[PDB]
Each structure stands twice: as structure tokens, then as C-alpha cells.
Amino acid sequence: QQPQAKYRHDYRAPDYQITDIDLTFDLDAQKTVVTAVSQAVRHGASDAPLRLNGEDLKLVSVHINDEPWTAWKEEEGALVISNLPERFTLKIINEISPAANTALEGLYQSGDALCTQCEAEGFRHITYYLDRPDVLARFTTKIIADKIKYPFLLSNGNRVAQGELENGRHWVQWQDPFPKPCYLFALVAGDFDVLRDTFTTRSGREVALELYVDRGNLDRAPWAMTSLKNSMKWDEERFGLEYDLDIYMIVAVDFFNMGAMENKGLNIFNSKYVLARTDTATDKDYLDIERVIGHEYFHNWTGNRVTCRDWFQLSLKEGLTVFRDQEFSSDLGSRAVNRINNVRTMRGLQFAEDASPMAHPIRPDMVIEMNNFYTLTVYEKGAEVIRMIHTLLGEENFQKGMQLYFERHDGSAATCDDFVQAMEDASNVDLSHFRRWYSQSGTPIVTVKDDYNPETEQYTLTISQRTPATPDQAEKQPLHIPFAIELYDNEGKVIPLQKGGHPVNSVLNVTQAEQTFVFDNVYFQPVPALLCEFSAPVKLEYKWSDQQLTFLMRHARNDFSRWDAAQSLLATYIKLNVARHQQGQPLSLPVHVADAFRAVLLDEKIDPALAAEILTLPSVNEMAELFDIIDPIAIAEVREALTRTLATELADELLAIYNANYQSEYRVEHEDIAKRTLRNACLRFLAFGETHLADVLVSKQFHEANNMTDALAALSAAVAAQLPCRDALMQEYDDKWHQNGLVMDKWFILQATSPAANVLETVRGLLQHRSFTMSNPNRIRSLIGAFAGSNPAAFHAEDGSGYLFLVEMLTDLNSRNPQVASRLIEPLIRLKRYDAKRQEKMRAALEQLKGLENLSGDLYEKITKALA
Ligand SMILES: [NH3+][C@H]1CCc2cccc(-c3ccccc3)c2CC1(O)O
Ligand SMILES: [Cl-]
Ligand SMILES: [Cl-]
Ligand SMILES: [Cl-]
Ligand SMILES: [Cl-]
Ligand code: NA
Ligand code: NA
Ligand code: NA
Ligand code: NA
Ligand code: NA
Ligand code: NA
Ligand code: NA
Ligand code: NA
Ligand code: NA
Ligand SMILES: [Zn+2]
């Protein structure tokens, strides 16, 4: 009764195309009537039926060339229409109920507004259609609604007609000239404030920009508007791409399963990625709005003008658009901080997915529920694969490849292979072996051994690779790994790479299971920097000495290498101290490790942006990936103990740098953000100083803050260190902000990730909090999701209480909102990484969920893999 898996190798062109669709919506929250008039063309055999997808539709009528049709049947998920001519007009009338749509897939209610989400397969919840992304149709959309309740009626494209009717109704008709797959359809109806502006493209096209927000929120919209203009300008400058319509609409909605969605000319955003004011939004919020506005804008070419032939090609648009958003953020802001944080995500979150039961290549081969594959792998590893192409080609060749990709595939629904072929053909770089990155799951492990020969002045790297088997793939092969290096002499100067009288490129092509690279004219023993700028998404095994690593922290040319060396240095002592914790022994840390961080604090020449990240310890999820068996309690308690030890050893320096980076003016400007991130990195440690000093410092910052970045940093510190002021500050924040859900999400996260012994009792009680509701995905993610995913020490309490709590929540969400349920179940799918007693409790939890009445396909897919 659960759906069967679908396979990439079963792709077949559609038997029918639809070239044009004329939609009419007679809108109502309880009942919406949809009329869909489609112009269809048969491409397949004359006896093949038209198979339309549809979910939870009330069919009213079926006509073919205005003839009521008798040769049809409804089956599970489908309307099957037989005996059709080669070309015909299909007319479907059906009814749907937005108010009953709690899954937020299709047409649904967000507060008093009506809005849509159609990716991946939501349009079939609106009408019977060819809901597959290689069917590209020209849409015209006529929306009829009560004028008082729904004064703004929006769909893709341009307004081409409008009218008024009896009984207080009105209508607007929209025409989008670009053929599209239906996952890019959008409709919005509601009452909004509208921020209006203009962008003029470099060739002179004036684009009207319209940001729709709830009434009263115009003064929270200018940063998103500014970011949209910045995105448009950057895509012109960096990629040579201009917007292609004369109207760009963005609608902010409060109820949205995703971050945002690139519907053509009518993006729909979670309010979290639009609304910002300095008293309510942090620096991180500002830069996330920039990133997400950019991402959705960049999809206009990488996703919309060229779309996906089938959903197994998702990374064609998502890896490439993530790469574009990273490059945008990096160009405008701190490249090093962006790269560092994307590598933290890869190593600490995506690597874990790639070892888990849900492991998949960036181009999946097997899918049950496609909405389960909007993953760290498809997105973030997808972007690392694009970035490897960029590394192998260089910017100029890479842009030639982009240009050839659009020239060949503009206006079509293409494949990952098409994209690689365009890059290969434009650049003359052979990517045949490289293609295996699209087909193979799991994280490669690259092992490096080195040798310096003083007699010949040669340095030899012996490099091996392997990918462990994953649950989805028993066969693994070597990859084409771009392996960037730099060699340093004793004075920190770069040693030129050469062999036999010729320069050697610093990107080594590691293509074999084992190979040897020899460098000549190496006159002194080198300190290597390896896998520079995380040049391939791999685990590196090299036997660093502590002093090589502190040398790199002082001398490496690229800021990323200095941070990465610090990570390698910490990793050794995180592993040491988790083993000690398990034997009841306290933290042990050589003096020279603390001194390396002391030197970072006192180095006046280091970019504060970099110093702040070096002084930000790995998260508990990053730490977990260091271990064969995760002990989440040891990891959490070692992270705190490490923080305390550094706070004590560096107390004077931390306070000096905290004070030196004080800023009385607040500005959303990258140099100011960097100083603030350094100051607040110091605050985290100072919060673990002597209690009375810490309590005073933290509470003062909370009360004196003139911006939410500094207020939240102080509040977070009070929770993390369990300071005396904590309860008072948390109550003050609630009393001030309880009516603002986006702001309370920060507070729910702090509650959920608290180190307090009674955290689960508190989290359970917050299910009844005035600012919490199970009807809102953001609230769910901020309280329940943060508990299960970001507080593994409490989620994995040895009494099993965290698993039982999550089962309760998932029993609700399986029925209410399966997409949110499927995001929330992920911590349980990782059970084989834990000790036997925890595995037993997690299996029991998953078996309870497996037995639910009306188990969603979303959860079924993950439960089945986890219990295998
Ligand atoms: N096509 C959509 C699908 C929904 C989805 C799912 C998971 C993540 C994201 C997302 C990634 C980076 C920045 C902002 C959002 C998105 C947005 C999207 O545009 O990719
Ligand atoms: Cl109604
Ligand atoms: Cl809003
Ligand atoms: Cl930290
Ligand atoms: Cl316990
Ligand atoms: Na016709
Ligand atoms: Na930059
Ligand atoms: Na499905
Ligand atoms: Na579904
Ligand atoms: Na050696
Ligand atoms: Na060595
Ligand atoms: Na180079
Ligand atoms: Na090679
Ligand atoms: Na509530
Ligand atoms: Zn995207």
C-alpha cells in the first residue's frame, strides 16, 4: 500500500506533452474550483492513454474538444484517459479545499492568505496534470476571489486582464510567456503591504520589484529588497545573466515548509528569509536573507530557463544554484568565513548523511518520496562537485561552460550529464572520470604519506583513496579528486612546485587508488598545506605534528588553511578527551595548544573574521564525525570542558579582545560584522569565567545591546553557562518578544539546546507556550527539531526519554505535515552510529512509527532504510 520506489534508469519520454494551459481558480478557503484547459499533443503510440497525476481532487468533469468524455477512469493517484486523438484540448474541472491542507503542499492557507507550494509534486494537488518536469507549458492563470478578503491576486508573469463581478468578487488574469514545468507554478491571494522598487538591467530593461509582506511590515522589507538588487547586479557582473521579465515579485508567508521557492517571477519565501530589523534580526539573519534571496534569484537561469528532465537530476539546479549563492555571498562578504562555514556543514552534517542509511549519490538512482531528496547531499555536496569543476577548469573556462550550457539547453529540461558535457566541451578538460562523482555515494578517504630526500632535494607525496561501502552501494571505485597543495619552507615562504625543470600545477589530479607525486628543487624540508580550500569533499588522513599545525596557523597564505589547521589540532585533543571522559577522567590539554589560540587572540594582523572562526569550537555534530561510535554525552561535556579550560587559560586576553572590539554604532557591514563575531566569540568563553564576573558581563551586554546580534549572543551565553541571570533574561525576552514568532524561534532554539538537566521537561512544557504551535513549521523546527538534532546529549539520554518524545511528535506530524515529520525523524535514522543499548531503544521507536495507521510515504522510506 506504500508507493513503490522509482528508478532513474526507468526514465522514458512522455507519451503526451502539454504545450499551453489556461487555468481558472474560483478561490475560496473551504472550496476552490479549478478549471484547467490544456492543449495536448501525443508523442507516443496511438493507443497509449493519457495518464494524469492527481491527489485529493474532487473531479467534476472531463471534456476532450468540448465533448464530455466517457473513456476515462480514476485510479490511485491518477486519471487515465483513453482513445485520444493526436492533438486535442483537455478540459478538467475539479474542486480542492485549501483550509483542509495542513501538509502545505499544493494550494493552502497561510494565516488569511492563500498560497501555493508545487515543488516537487504539489501541482497534482491542484488539478489533474502531467506533474513531471520535462513537460513544459505556457501558463495563463485567471484568479477569481472576494475582493475584500483577497485584494491582491498574483500568479506568474504579467497581468493581462482584470475585471469586477457581482457580489463583491473580482478577478485578475496572468500570462507567463516562458514554458515551464508545473512545479514552478505559483498563486497567491491575500491582503499585503507592498514595497515597490526598480532594477535597471545592464542593457536597460527596467524591472519592477515588488515585495509583498503582511500589513505593518514594510519597515522590515528594505534589506531583502536591497539584497534582490544586489543579486541581480552580481549575476550580471559574474555570470553575464540578466533578468528576463519586467516584474519580479516576492511574497513573504509565515507558513512554509521550505526556506523559499523560485516560482518564475513570483517567488514565495518563508518570512524568516525576508523580514529584518536591527532590534529583531541578527547579523546571521541578514546574511541568510542575502543568501536565500540570491539563491532564489539565481534559479531564474539555473532551474527555470534550464530546468530538470526528471527529479533524479535535482542537483543540476540545486548544486549549481548553491554554488552560485556561495560565490555571491563570498564575493560580497568574507570569502574565508563563507568557505569555512560551508566546510563545517559538509564535514559535520553532510558527511554524516553520506554514511547513514539514507546515503545517496548527488544524482540519486532510487527514490520513493522525492521530497525526501532535498538533502545536504544534493545541495551542499552537489555544490562541492560544481566547485571541483570550477577548480579543474578555472573561472574563464567555467564561464565558457556556463555559456555553452545555456546556449544548448535554454528552454529545455536537461540532465546532470548535459551540464558536465557542456563544461567538458567548452573547456577541453576531460571530465569522463569526473562524472563518477554523480553516481557514487559516500565520502572518500584520502590518505597522504610524505618523504623528504635531502640528497636529491625531492619531496614525495604518496596519496591513496578509498570510499567505504555505503548501504545503497556495494561497489565503489576511485574518483577524480582535485587535491590542492602548498609547500612552506622554514620561514613560511611558499616553495615553488616543479619537476624536471617544469612547473607543476598545485591542483594534483588524484585519480588512482594509489599514486606518487614527486617535486624537485625542494631545498628545505617542507611543511605541507593539504586539501587547500577543501578542494574535494573528502576526509584527509595525514599524520600531522602539533607543530606543523601551529606553524600553518601562523604562516599559511590562505585564511581557510589557518582555520583548517586549527581544526586538525583540536581534533586530536577532542578525541583524547572523549576517551578520558568515558573513563571518568578530566580534561587534559598540552600548554602549547592553548598558546596557539592565545597567539590568534593577540595577532594584530589576522582578519577578525578569521580569528572569530578559529575561536569558534566545532559543534557537537562536527565533533561526532570524529568518532566511530558516537558518545553524545561525552562529546557535549568535553566541548564544555574545553571551553572552560580555554576560558581560564586565556581569561585576560579574551577580555582585552572583547573590549577592544566594542562598537557603539551598529551597522550591517562586513567589517563591523567581523568585529562583532570576534567580540561575541570571546564572550562565549568569558561566560565560563568566574561566575560573578561572567554573570555581570553577560547580563550587561544583554541589557545594553542596541541590536539583536549582541542581545542574542549574551542570552545564548547565559543559557550555555547556566549563569545566575539566565532565568530573568529568558523571561524578559519572552515578555518583550512573544508576539513575534521569528524572534521567539531563537528563544525556542536556546531552550531546546540548553545544557540544563531538566531540558526535556522544559521543552515538553513549551508545547503549550503562547508563542508555540504545531501548525507552524518554523515553530516545530525551532523547538522540537532543535532538541532532537542539535541537543543530541539530551535527545540520546540513556533513559530513552528523548526518543519517546520524538515518537509522540512524529505521530502527530506524520498525519499533519509529513514533510516536516520527515525532516524531524532524521536523528533516529542514525541509530547504528550509537552504542547497542541506544540502538535497541531507537529501533523500538522506529518500529512503533512503522506501525502507524496511515504511515506517510515520507516516513516509510526513511524508517525502512533505518530498520534494514
Ligand atoms: N527549489 C527550492 C526547493 C525547496 C528547498 C529545500 C531545501 C533547501 C532549499 C534552500 C537552499 C538554499 C537556500 C535557500 C533554500 C530549498 C529552496 C529551493 O529554492 O531550492
Ligand atoms: Cl471560504
Ligand atoms: Cl510577512
Ligand atoms: Cl566556541
Ligand atoms: Cl537518562
Ligand atoms: Na481543440
Ligand atoms: Na569577498
Ligand atoms: Na510521492
Ligand atoms: Na508526498
Ligand atoms: Na613519512
Ligand atoms: Na610527515
Ligand atoms: Na595553483
Ligand atoms: Na593522476
Ligand atoms: Na500555543
Ligand atoms: Zn534551490
Swiss-Prot record:
A Gene Ontology cellular-component term: plasma membrane
Known cofactor(s): Zn(2+)
One Pfam family hit: Peptidase_M1
Residues binding Zn(2+), per UniProt: H295, H299, E318
Highest taxon, organism lineage: Bacteria
UniProt: substrate binding residues: E119, G259, A260, M261, E262, N263
SUPFAM superfamilies in the cross-refs: Leukotriene A4 hydrolase N-terminal domain, Metalloproteases ('zincins'), catalytic domain
Disrupted gene: phenotype observed: A quadruple peptidase disruption (pepA, pepB, pepD and pepN) does not grow in M9 minimal medium, does grow better when supplemented with casamino acids.
Major subcellular location class: membrane
Site (Transition state stabilizer): Y379
Name this polypeptide is given: Aminopeptidase N
Organism, scientific name: Escherichia coli (strain K12)
Gene, per the UniProt record: pepN
